Amino acid sequence: TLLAKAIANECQANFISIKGPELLTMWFGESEANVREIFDKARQAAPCVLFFDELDSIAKARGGNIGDGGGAADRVINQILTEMDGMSTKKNVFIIGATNRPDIIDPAILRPGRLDQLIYIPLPDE
Amino acid sequence: NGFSGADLTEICQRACKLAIRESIESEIRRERQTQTNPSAMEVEEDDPVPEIRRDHFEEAMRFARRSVSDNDIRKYEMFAQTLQQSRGFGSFRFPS
């Protein structure tokens, strides 16, 4: 989160942080249309860096790694994917995702036009 | 790109087999030709295929196959990094 904030600060770009509790609230309440509002806010604040901290919360909520009988697809992540695909002309908004469980993350998240650039944040050195 | 030693050996063996079959078939036909049409003067032209050529190797490589899949190589890479020398001592320096 601090790294994303620092990258936003260097470019003097607004920073919007969507924590895991917000995604889980949209999932439990079955109100995933608010993701569209989030992206609209990002558009209004462009240039902006839309950061989705701990994006794997919904996958954990459905069972963690074993999960439910279904696949990796979920309502909130699906809305995020739709918005990200449509969020290509803006250019200003930059989407940064953070996840402590990359294994359970939806593979569609990593397809081109999505969060392609995976960066490993390892434990700090001396 | 990723052929194992066994795969390369199989390719070489198949090329040699193709060359041997072609040589046998050719000299067999050539022997019919003398039996069918006895030539007045005997003049053997030696072997029609004395050594393995490019076409034999191309036909053999046509059947080349990768015995070792990339998933089992991935498991071996996992075990190799399962003998990982830690991740905090790489910069160990004595106090001086």
PDB file of N, CA, C and O in Angstrom, chain A residues 34-99:
ATOM      1  N   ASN A  34     -21.695  -0.869  -7.491  1.00  0.00           N
ATOM      2  CA  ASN A  34     -20.964   0.263  -6.943  1.00  0.00           C
ATOM      3  C   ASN A  34     -19.542   0.306  -7.468  1.00  0.00           C
ATOM      4  O   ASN A  34     -18.909   1.366  -7.426  1.00  0.00           O
ATOM      5  N   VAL A  35     -19.062  -0.798  -8.040  1.00  0.00           N
ATOM      6  CA  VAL A  35     -17.738  -0.779  -8.643  1.00  0.00           C
ATOM      7  C   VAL A  35     -17.740   0.193  -9.805  1.00  0.00           C
ATOM      8  O   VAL A  35     -16.774   0.937 -10.021  1.00  0.00           O
ATOM      9  N   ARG A  36     -18.856   0.250 -10.533  1.00  0.00           N
ATOM     10  CA  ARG A  36     -18.942   1.200 -11.630  1.00  0.00           C
ATOM     11  C   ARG A  36     -18.821   2.617 -11.098  1.00  0.00           C
ATOM     12  O   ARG A  36     -18.072   3.432 -11.649  1.00  0.00           O
ATOM     13  N   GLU A  37     -19.470   2.896  -9.966  1.00  0.00           N
ATOM     14  CA  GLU A  37     -19.358   4.225  -9.384  1.00  0.00           C
ATOM     15  C   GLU A  37     -17.921   4.505  -8.985  1.00  0.00           C
ATOM     16  O   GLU A  37     -17.408   5.608  -9.213  1.00  0.00           O
ATOM     17  N   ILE A  38     -17.231   3.497  -8.450  1.00  0.00           N
ATOM     18  CA  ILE A  38     -15.837   3.693  -8.071  1.00  0.00           C
ATOM     19  C   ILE A  38     -15.030   4.092  -9.294  1.00  0.00           C
ATOM     20  O   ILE A  38     -14.265   5.064  -9.271  1.00  0.00           O
ATOM     21  N   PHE A  39     -15.242   3.385 -10.404  1.00  0.00           N
ATOM     22  CA  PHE A  39     -14.462   3.701 -11.590  1.00  0.00           C
ATOM     23  C   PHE A  39     -14.826   5.075 -12.118  1.00  0.00           C
ATOM     24  O   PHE A  39     -13.948   5.811 -12.583  1.00  0.00           O
ATOM     25  N   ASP A  40     -16.091   5.473 -11.980  1.00  0.00           N
ATOM     26  CA  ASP A  40     -16.461   6.812 -12.414  1.00  0.00           C
ATOM     27  C   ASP A  40     -15.743   7.849 -11.570  1.00  0.00           C
ATOM     28  O   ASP A  40     -15.235   8.846 -12.095  1.00  0.00           O
ATOM     29  N   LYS A  41     -15.625   7.591 -10.268  1.00  0.00           N
ATOM     30  CA  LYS A  41     -14.878   8.507  -9.418  1.00  0.00           C
ATOM     31  C   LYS A  41     -13.432   8.582  -9.876  1.00  0.00           C
ATOM     32  O   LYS A  41     -12.868   9.676 -10.005  1.00  0.00           O
ATOM     33  N   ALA A  42     -12.854   7.435 -10.238  1.00  0.00           N
ATOM     34  CA  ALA A  42     -11.483   7.443 -10.729  1.00  0.00           C
ATOM     35  C   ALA A  42     -11.384   8.295 -11.980  1.00  0.00           C
ATOM     36  O   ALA A  42     -10.414   9.037 -12.166  1.00  0.00           O
ATOM     37  N   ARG A  43     -12.383   8.194 -12.855  1.00  0.00           N
ATOM     38  CA  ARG A  43     -12.370   8.990 -14.073  1.00  0.00           C
ATOM     39  C   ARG A  43     -12.439  10.475 -13.742  1.00  0.00           C
ATOM     40  O   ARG A  43     -11.718  11.287 -14.333  1.00  0.00           O
ATOM     41  N   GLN A  44     -13.305  10.850 -12.795  1.00  0.00           N
ATOM     42  CA  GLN A  44     -13.443  12.256 -12.433  1.00  0.00           C
ATOM     43  C   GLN A  44     -12.163  12.814 -11.827  1.00  0.00           C
ATOM     44  O   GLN A  44     -11.850  13.994 -12.016  1.00  0.00           O
ATOM     45  N   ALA A  45     -11.415  11.987 -11.104  1.00  0.00           N
ATOM     46  CA  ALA A  45     -10.192  12.414 -10.441  1.00  0.00           C
ATOM     47  C   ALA A  45      -8.956  12.218 -11.304  1.00  0.00           C
ATOM     48  O   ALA A  45      -7.839  12.436 -10.825  1.00  0.00           O
ATOM     49  N   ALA A  46      -9.126  11.813 -12.556  1.00  0.00           N
ATOM     50  CA  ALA A  46      -7.977  11.568 -13.410  1.00  0.00           C
ATOM     51  C   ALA A  46      -7.191  12.861 -13.612  1.00  0.00           C
ATOM     52  O   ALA A  46      -7.787  13.936 -13.751  1.00  0.00           O
ATOM     53  N   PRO A  47      -5.853  12.798 -13.633  1.00  0.00           N
ATOM     54  CA  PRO A  47      -5.136  11.523 -13.556  1.00  0.00           C
ATOM     55  C   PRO A  47      -5.146  10.949 -12.143  1.00  0.00           C
ATOM     56  O   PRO A  47      -4.959  11.690 -11.180  1.00  0.00           O
ATOM     57  N   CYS A  48      -5.357   9.639 -12.029  1.00  0.00           N
ATOM     58  CA  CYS A  48      -5.502   8.986 -10.738  1.00  0.00           C
ATOM     59  C   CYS A  48      -4.878   7.600 -10.788  1.00  0.00           C
ATOM     60  O   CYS A  48      -4.647   7.038 -11.860  1.00  0.00           O
ATOM     61  N   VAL A  49      -4.607   7.056  -9.605  1.00  0.00           N
ATOM     62  CA  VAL A  49      -4.072   5.707  -9.451  1.00  0.00           C
ATOM     63  C   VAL A  49      -5.062   4.934  -8.589  1.00  0.00           C
ATOM     64  O   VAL A  49      -5.068   5.067  -7.360  1.00  0.00           O
ATOM     65  N   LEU A  50      -5.902   4.125  -9.228  1.00  0.00           N
ATOM     66  CA  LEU A  50      -6.902   3.325  -8.530  1.00  0.00           C
ATOM     67  C   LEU A  50      -6.239   2.057  -8.009  1.00  0.00           C
ATOM     68  O   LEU A  50      -5.876   1.172  -8.791  1.00  0.00           O
ATOM     69  N   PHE A  51      -6.077   1.962  -6.694  1.00  0.00           N
ATOM     70  CA  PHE A  51      -5.407   0.837  -6.057  1.00  0.00           C
ATOM     71  C   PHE A  51      -6.435  -0.045  -5.367  1.00  0.00           C
ATOM     72  O   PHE A  51      -7.231   0.441  -4.557  1.00  0.00           O
ATOM     73  N   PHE A  52      -6.413  -1.338  -5.681  1.00  0.00           N
ATOM     74  CA  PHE A  52      -7.309  -2.320  -5.074  1.00  0.00           C
ATOM     75  C   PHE A  52      -6.483  -3.144  -4.096  1.00  0.00           C
ATOM     76  O   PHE A  52      -5.963  -4.210  -4.437  1.00  0.00           O
ATOM     77  N   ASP A  53      -6.374  -2.648  -2.869  1.00  0.00           N
ATOM     78  CA  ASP A  53      -5.583  -3.346  -1.867  1.00  0.00           C
ATOM     79  C   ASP A  53      -6.226  -4.668  -1.485  1.00  0.00           C
ATOM     80  O   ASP A  53      -7.447  -4.773  -1.372  1.00  0.00           O
ATOM     81  N   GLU A  54      -5.402  -5.688  -1.287  1.00  0.00           N
ATOM     82  CA  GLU A  54      -5.889  -7.000  -0.856  1.00  0.00           C
ATOM     83  C   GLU A  54      -7.124  -7.445  -1.653  1.00  0.00           C
ATOM     84  O   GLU A  54      -8.198  -7.772  -1.131  1.00  0.00           O
ATOM     85  N   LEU A  55      -6.900  -7.520  -2.962  1.00  0.00           N
ATOM     86  CA  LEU A  55      -7.918  -7.917  -3.924  1.00  0.00           C
ATOM     87  C   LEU A  55      -8.385  -9.360  -3.759  1.00  0.00           C
ATOM     88  O   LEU A  55      -9.427  -9.721  -4.309  1.00  0.00           O
ATOM     89  N   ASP A  56      -7.658 -10.195  -3.020  1.00  0.00           N
ATOM     90  CA  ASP A  56      -8.027 -11.600  -2.890  1.00  0.00           C
ATOM     91  C   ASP A  56      -9.017 -11.872  -1.763  1.00  0.00           C
ATOM     92  O   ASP A  56      -9.277 -13.041  -1.457  1.00  0.00           O
ATOM     93  N   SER A  57      -9.566 -10.830  -1.136  1.00  0.00           N
ATOM     94  CA  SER A  57     -10.448 -11.041   0.008  1.00  0.00           C
ATOM     95  C   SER A  57     -11.679 -11.854  -0.372  1.00  0.00           C
ATOM     96  O   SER A  57     -12.101 -12.739   0.381  1.00  0.00           O
ATOM     97  N   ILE A  58     -12.274 -11.564  -1.532  1.00  0.00           N
ATOM     98  CA  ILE A  58     -13.480 -12.276  -1.952  1.00  0.00           C
ATOM     99  C   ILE A  58     -13.186 -13.748  -2.209  1.00  0.00           C
ATOM    100  O   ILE A  58     -14.002 -14.619  -1.891  1.00  0.00           O
ATOM    101  N   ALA A  59     -12.028 -14.055  -2.799  1.00  0.00           N
ATOM    102  CA  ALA A  59     -11.676 -15.453  -3.021  1.00  0.00           C
ATOM    103  C   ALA A  59     -11.524 -16.198  -1.702  1.00  0.00           C
ATOM    104  O   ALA A  59     -11.959 -17.349  -1.575  1.00  0.00           O
ATOM    105  N   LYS A  60     -10.904 -15.560  -0.709  1.00  0.00           N
ATOM    106  CA  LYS A  60     -10.778 -16.177   0.607  1.00  0.00           C
ATOM    107  C   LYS A  60     -12.144 -16.390   1.245  1.00  0.00           C
ATOM    108  O   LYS A  60     -12.396 -17.430   1.864  1.00  0.00           O
ATOM    109  N   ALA A  61     -13.040 -15.411   1.103  1.00  0.00           N
ATOM    110  CA  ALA A  61     -14.369 -15.517   1.695  1.00  0.00           C
ATOM    111  C   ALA A  61     -15.147 -16.708   1.152  1.00  0.00           C
ATOM    112  O   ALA A  61     -15.971 -17.285   1.870  1.00  0.00           O
ATOM    113  N   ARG A  62     -14.912 -17.092  -0.100  1.00  0.00           N
ATOM    114  CA  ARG A  62     -15.616 -18.225  -0.686  1.00  0.00           C
ATOM    115  C   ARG A  62     -14.982 -19.568  -0.351  1.00  0.00           C
ATOM    116  O   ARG A  62     -15.347 -20.574  -0.970  1.00  0.00           O
ATOM    117  N   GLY A  63     -14.048 -19.618   0.594  1.00  0.00           N
ATOM    118  CA  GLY A  63     -13.420 -20.877   0.942  1.00  0.00           C
ATOM    119  C   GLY A  63     -11.906 -20.857   0.966  1.00  0.00           C
ATOM    120  O   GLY A  63     -11.277 -21.875   1.263  1.00  0.00           O
ATOM    121  N   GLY A  64     -11.308 -19.712   0.655  1.00  0.00           N
ATOM    122  CA  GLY A  64      -9.863 -19.606   0.659  1.00  0.00           C
ATOM    123  C   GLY A  64      -9.224 -20.129  -0.610  1.00  0.00           C
ATOM    124  O   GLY A  64      -9.323 -19.500  -1.668  1.00  0.00           O
ATOM    125  N   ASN A  65      -8.572 -21.288  -0.520  1.00  0.00           N
ATOM    126  CA  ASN A  65      -7.976 -21.934  -1.683  1.00  0.00           C
ATOM    127  C   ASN A  65      -8.865 -23.033  -2.250  1.00  0.00           C
ATOM    128  O   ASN A  65      -9.085 -23.085  -3.464  1.00  0.00           O
ATOM    129  N   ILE A  66      -9.383 -23.918  -1.396  1.00  0.00           N
ATOM    130  CA  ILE A  66     -10.295 -24.952  -1.876  1.00  0.00           C
ATOM    131  C   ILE A  66     -11.533 -24.312  -2.490  1.00  0.00           C
ATOM    132  O   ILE A  66     -12.050 -24.775  -3.514  1.00  0.00           O
ATOM    133  N   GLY A  67     -12.024 -23.239  -1.875  1.00  0.00           N
ATOM    134  CA  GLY A  67     -13.179 -22.520  -2.364  1.00  0.00           C
ATOM    135  C   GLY A  67     -14.467 -23.327  -2.311  1.00  0.00           C
ATOM    136  O   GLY A  67     -14.595 -24.333  -1.607  1.00  0.00           O
ATOM    137  N   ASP A  68     -15.436 -22.854  -3.087  1.00  0.00           N
ATOM    138  CA  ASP A  68     -16.736 -23.490  -3.220  1.00  0.00           C
ATOM    139  C   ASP A  68     -16.706 -24.412  -4.439  1.00  0.00           C
ATOM    140  O   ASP A  68     -15.650 -24.660  -5.028  1.00  0.00           O
ATOM    141  N   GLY A  69     -17.867 -24.937  -4.834  1.00  0.00           N
ATOM    142  CA  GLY A  69     -17.910 -25.773  -6.019  1.00  0.00           C
ATOM    143  C   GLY A  69     -17.652 -25.014  -7.303  1.00  0.00           C
ATOM    144  O   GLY A  69     -17.247 -25.622  -8.299  1.00  0.00           O
ATOM    145  N   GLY A  70     -17.874 -23.701  -7.300  1.00  0.00           N
ATOM    146  CA  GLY A  70     -17.675 -22.890  -8.479  1.00  0.00           C
ATOM    147  C   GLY A  70     -16.208 -22.594  -8.719  1.00  0.00           C
ATOM    148  O   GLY A  70     -15.317 -23.069  -8.014  1.00  0.00           O
ATOM    149  N   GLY A  71     -15.955 -21.788  -9.744  1.00  0.00           N
ATOM    150  CA  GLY A  71     -14.608 -21.418 -10.119  1.00  0.00           C
ATOM    151  C   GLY A  71     -14.155 -20.132  -9.461  1.00  0.00           C
ATOM    152  O   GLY A  71     -14.726 -19.672  -8.469  1.00  0.00           O
ATOM    153  N   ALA A  72     -13.105 -19.544 -10.034  1.00  0.00           N
ATOM    154  CA  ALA A  72     -12.537 -18.315  -9.494  1.00  0.00           C
ATOM    155  C   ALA A  72     -13.399 -17.087  -9.752  1.00  0.00           C
ATOM    156  O   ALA A  72     -13.165 -16.049  -9.126  1.00  0.00           O
ATOM    157  N   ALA A  73     -14.378 -17.175 -10.647  1.00  0.00           N
ATOM    158  CA  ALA A  73     -15.188 -16.012 -10.981  1.00  0.00           C
ATOM    159  C   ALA A  73     -16.131 -15.641  -9.844  1.00  0.00           C
ATOM    160  O   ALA A  73     -16.730 -16.506  -9.199  1.00  0.00           O
ATOM    161  N   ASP A  74     -16.260 -14.337  -9.604  1.00  0.00           N
ATOM    162  CA  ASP A  74     -17.153 -13.809  -8.584  1.00  0.00           C
ATOM    163  C   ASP A  74     -17.720 -12.488  -9.083  1.00  0.00           C
ATOM    164  O   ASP A  74     -17.204 -11.887 -10.028  1.00  0.00           O
ATOM    165  N   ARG A  75     -18.797 -12.041  -8.435  1.00  0.00           N
ATOM    166  CA  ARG A  75     -19.520 -10.868  -8.919  1.00  0.00           C
ATOM    167  C   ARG A  75     -18.647  -9.618  -8.913  1.00  0.00           C
ATOM    168  O   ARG A  75     -18.566  -8.898  -9.917  1.00  0.00           O
ATOM    169  N   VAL A  76     -17.989  -9.337  -7.788  1.00  0.00           N
ATOM    170  CA  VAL A  76     -17.230  -8.095  -7.661  1.00  0.00           C
ATOM    171  C   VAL A  76     -16.041  -8.086  -8.613  1.00  0.00           C
ATOM    172  O   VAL A  76     -15.785  -7.092  -9.304  1.00  0.00           O
ATOM    173  N   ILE A  77     -15.303  -9.194  -8.675  1.00  0.00           N
ATOM    174  CA  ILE A  77     -14.164  -9.256  -9.583  1.00  0.00           C
ATOM    175  C   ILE A  77     -14.632  -9.201 -11.028  1.00  0.00           C
ATOM    176  O   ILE A  77     -13.950  -8.639 -11.891  1.00  0.00           O
ATOM    177  N   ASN A  78     -15.780  -9.805 -11.329  1.00  0.00           N
ATOM    178  CA  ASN A  78     -16.313  -9.706 -12.683  1.00  0.00           C
ATOM    179  C   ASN A  78     -16.643  -8.265 -13.054  1.00  0.00           C
ATOM    180  O   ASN A  78     -16.375  -7.827 -14.180  1.00  0.00           O
ATOM    181  N   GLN A  79     -17.247  -7.515 -12.130  1.00  0.00           N
ATOM    182  CA  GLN A  79     -17.529  -6.113 -12.421  1.00  0.00           C
ATOM    183  C   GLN A  79     -16.234  -5.334 -12.599  1.00  0.00           C
ATOM    184  O   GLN A  79     -16.139  -4.459 -13.467  1.00  0.00           O
ATOM    185  N   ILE A  80     -15.221  -5.655 -11.792  1.00  0.00           N
ATOM    186  CA  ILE A  80     -13.929  -4.989 -11.921  1.00  0.00           C
ATOM    187  C   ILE A  80     -13.319  -5.274 -13.287  1.00  0.00           C
ATOM    188  O   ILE A  80     -12.753  -4.382 -13.925  1.00  0.00           O
ATOM    189  N   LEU A  81     -13.401  -6.526 -13.744  1.00  0.00           N
ATOM    190  CA  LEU A  81     -12.888  -6.883 -15.066  1.00  0.00           C
ATOM    191  C   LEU A  81     -13.626  -6.143 -16.171  1.00  0.00           C
ATOM    192  O   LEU A  81     -13.007  -5.652 -17.122  1.00  0.00           O
ATOM    193  N   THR A  82     -14.956  -6.068 -16.075  1.00  0.00           N
ATOM    194  CA  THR A  82     -15.712  -5.352 -17.096  1.00  0.00           C
ATOM    195  C   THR A  82     -15.299  -3.888 -17.142  1.00  0.00           C
ATOM    196  O   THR A  82     -15.077  -3.323 -18.222  1.00  0.00           O
ATOM    197  N   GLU A  83     -15.177  -3.261 -15.970  1.00  0.00           N
ATOM    198  CA  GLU A  83     -14.815  -1.851 -15.919  1.00  0.00           C
ATOM    199  C   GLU A  83     -13.396  -1.635 -16.427  1.00  0.00           C
ATOM    200  O   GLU A  83     -13.123  -0.653 -17.125  1.00  0.00           O
ATOM    201  N   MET A  84     -12.477  -2.545 -16.086  1.00  0.00           N
ATOM    202  CA  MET A  84     -11.098  -2.429 -16.544  1.00  0.00           C
ATOM    203  C   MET A  84     -11.011  -2.569 -18.054  1.00  0.00           C
ATOM    204  O   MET A  84     -10.232  -1.865 -18.705  1.00  0.00           O
ATOM    205  N   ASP A  85     -11.792  -3.482 -18.631  1.00  0.00           N
ATOM    206  CA  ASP A  85     -11.805  -3.595 -20.082  1.00  0.00           C
ATOM    207  C   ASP A  85     -12.359  -2.327 -20.713  1.00  0.00           C
ATOM    208  O   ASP A  85     -11.818  -1.832 -21.708  1.00  0.00           O
ATOM    209  N   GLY A  86     -13.453  -1.794 -20.166  1.00  0.00           N
ATOM    210  CA  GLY A  86     -13.951  -0.535 -20.682  1.00  0.00           C
ATOM    211  C   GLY A  86     -13.126   0.665 -20.269  1.00  0.00           C
ATOM    212  O   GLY A  86     -13.239   1.722 -20.898  1.00  0.00           O
ATOM    213  N   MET A  87     -12.304   0.531 -19.227  1.00  0.00           N
ATOM    214  CA  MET A  87     -11.468   1.635 -18.746  1.00  0.00           C
ATOM    215  C   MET A  87     -10.107   1.639 -19.444  1.00  0.00           C
ATOM    216  O   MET A  87      -9.055   1.499 -18.822  1.00  0.00           O
ATOM    217  N   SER A  88     -10.136   1.783 -20.766  1.00  0.00           N
ATOM    218  CA  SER A  88      -8.905   1.802 -21.544  1.00  0.00           C
ATOM    219  C   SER A  88      -8.636   3.137 -22.213  1.00  0.00           C
ATOM    220  O   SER A  88      -7.473   3.509 -22.373  1.00  0.00           O
ATOM    221  N   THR A  89      -9.683   3.858 -22.614  1.00  0.00           N
ATOM    222  CA  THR A  89      -9.500   5.144 -23.273  1.00  0.00           C
ATOM    223  C   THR A  89      -9.044   6.236 -22.314  1.00  0.00           C
ATOM    224  O   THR A  89      -8.459   7.227 -22.760  1.00  0.00           O
ATOM    225  N   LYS A  90      -9.298   6.082 -21.011  1.00  0.00           N
ATOM    226  CA  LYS A  90      -9.058   7.186 -20.085  1.00  0.00           C
ATOM    227  C   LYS A  90      -7.582   7.561 -20.034  1.00  0.00           C
ATOM    228  O   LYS A  90      -7.237   8.747 -19.990  1.00  0.00           O
ATOM    229  N   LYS A  91      -6.699   6.565 -20.028  1.00  0.00           N
ATOM    230  CA  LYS A  91      -5.260   6.794 -20.001  1.00  0.00           C
ATOM    231  C   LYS A  91      -4.768   7.351 -18.670  1.00  0.00           C
ATOM    232  O   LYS A  91      -3.727   6.921 -18.162  1.00  0.00           O
ATOM    233  N   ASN A  92      -5.502   8.304 -18.095  1.00  0.00           N
ATOM    234  CA  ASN A  92      -5.089   8.876 -16.818  1.00  0.00           C
ATOM    235  C   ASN A  92      -5.150   7.847 -15.695  1.00  0.00           C
ATOM    236  O   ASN A  92      -4.185   7.680 -14.944  1.00  0.00           O
ATOM    237  N   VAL A  93      -6.271   7.144 -15.557  1.00  0.00           N
ATOM    238  CA  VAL A  93      -6.422   6.245 -14.421  1.00  0.00           C
ATOM    239  C   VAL A  93      -5.456   5.078 -14.558  1.00  0.00           C
ATOM    240  O   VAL A  93      -5.306   4.494 -15.637  1.00  0.00           O
ATOM    241  N   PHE A  94      -4.792   4.733 -13.460  1.00  0.00           N
ATOM    242  CA  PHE A  94      -3.851   3.622 -13.419  1.00  0.00           C
ATOM    243  C   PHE A  94      -4.285   2.673 -12.314  1.00  0.00           C
ATOM    244  O   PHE A  94      -4.437   3.091 -11.162  1.00  0.00           O
ATOM    245  N   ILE A  95      -4.480   1.405 -12.657  1.00  0.00           N
ATOM    246  CA  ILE A  95      -5.022   0.424 -11.725  1.00  0.00           C
ATOM    247  C   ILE A  95      -3.877  -0.393 -11.144  1.00  0.00           C
ATOM    248  O   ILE A  95      -3.095  -1.000 -11.884  1.00  0.00           O
ATOM    249  N   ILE A  96      -3.783  -0.408  -9.817  1.00  0.00           N
ATOM    250  CA  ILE A  96      -2.772  -1.164  -9.089  1.00  0.00           C
ATOM    251  C   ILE A  96      -3.496  -2.123  -8.157  1.00  0.00           C
ATOM    252  O   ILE A  96      -4.404  -1.712  -7.426  1.00  0.00           O
ATOM    253  N   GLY A  97      -3.104  -3.391  -8.183  1.00  0.00           N
ATOM    254  CA  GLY A  97      -3.702  -4.397  -7.330  1.00  0.00           C
ATOM    255  C   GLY A  97      -2.683  -5.003  -6.386  1.00  0.00           C
ATOM    256  O   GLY A  97      -1.507  -5.140  -6.721  1.00  0.00           O
ATOM    257  N   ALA A  98      -3.149  -5.363  -5.194  1.00  0.00           N
ATOM    258  CA  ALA A  98      -2.326  -5.986  -4.172  1.00  0.00           C
ATOM    259  C   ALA A  98      -3.029  -7.233  -3.664  1.00  0.00           C
ATOM    260  O   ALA A  98      -4.241  -7.220  -3.436  1.00  0.00           O
ATOM    261  N   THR A  99      -2.268  -8.310  -3.487  1.00  0.00           N
ATOM    262  CA  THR A  99      -2.841  -9.571  -3.041  1.00  0.00           C
ATOM    263  C   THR A  99      -1.772 -10.391  -2.340  1.00  0.00           C
ATOM    264  O   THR A  99      -0.674 -10.571  -2.872  1.00  0.00           O
TER     265      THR A  99
END
